[PDB]
Design a protein around this ligand. Structure first.
Ligand SMILES: [Ca+2]
Ligand SMILES: [Ca+2]
Ligand SMILES: [Ca+2]
Lengths: 45, 199, 42
């Protein structure tokens, strides 16, 4: 439900922002593969 | 080393009129002898000037000569955040081969002047005279995402700032250094170096 | 439309991070609006 709860932990905070930056950092280094795929590989979900 | 840098095609593309005109300076270390150079770890600093309190969101590519060996942080990162990002609560260095990608974010424009990022690099024992190890800061874009240097709200001001940063704040193929070392190394797109001299 | 693209420019990059991070610094201190409301009111 919550727009902007990227880690899907019910609330919107620091951690969500971290996910997006760390994601951006990966794509910026050649990482193909989506946000959900990344969050899985890094055990954020 | 190669020129991974791209052309800044965002709009605005011309940053001269920008209220904030940030310049990134990269360490330039010179050794007199191969002797003093070999095995030495150089602290390479990516230091920003002219943007206290004027940026929030950041992200840019760093690269260096293949023959250098980065020494990672305790957590395996190739770069460690410096004093300028101390009030930016988000920072990340993602490893990238013979390079690293570094990115910032903050809850207001708490970007500071000073050392943004530190990178510990080490020289071969096969050091040689006149050797030049270029260190590049580079802009990279594609349709999925691009590099950044903007304020908390990506204002008109922010984008002018960003255009400056990449087109004029750093060196690229289209703003080349004339450093006698980066010339001797056809790495005029590069920004800093570790170097040694002839006899 | 794109999961991750808070600001909704087709693009996931550090700007989206900073949006959330600032959103949190507001709520944290007593903001009542949605993320969508907050974003648009800038
Ligand atoms: Ca969350
Ligand atoms: Ca460069
Ligand atoms: Ca976006």
């Amino acid at each position: 439900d919550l727009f902007g709860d990227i880690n899907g932990d019910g609330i919107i905070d620091g951690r969500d922002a971290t996910v997006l930056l760390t994601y951006y950092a990966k794509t910026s280094t050649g990482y193909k593969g989506s946000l959900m795929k990344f969050m899985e590989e890094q055990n954020i979900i | 080393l190669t020129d991974r840098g791209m052309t800044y095609d965002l709009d605005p593309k011309d940053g001269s009129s920008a209220a904030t005109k940030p310049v990134l300076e990269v360490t330039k270390k010179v050794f007199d002898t191969a002797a003093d150079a070999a095995g030495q770890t150089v602290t390479v600093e990516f230091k920003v000037s002219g943007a206290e309190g004027k940026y929030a969101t950041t992200g840019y590519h760093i690269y260096w000569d293949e023959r250098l060996e980065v020494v990672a942080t305790k957590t395996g990162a190739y770069a460690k955040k410096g004093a300028a990002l101390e009030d930016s609560s988000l920072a990340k260095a993602e490893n990238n081969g013979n390079g690293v990608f570094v990115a910032s974010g903050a809850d207001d424009d708490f970007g500071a002047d000073g050392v943004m990022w530190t990178v510990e690099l080490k020289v071969p024992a096969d050091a040689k005279a006149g050797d030049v190890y270029p260190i590049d800061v580079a802009y990279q874009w594609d349709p999925s995402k691009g590099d950044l240097f903007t304020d908390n709200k990506d204002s008109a001001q922010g984008k002018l700032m960003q255009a400056y940063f990449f087109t004029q704040g750093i060196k690229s193929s289209s703003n080349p250094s004339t450093d006698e070392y980066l010339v001797k190394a056809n790495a005029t797109y590069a920004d800093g170096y570790i170097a040694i001299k002839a006899g």
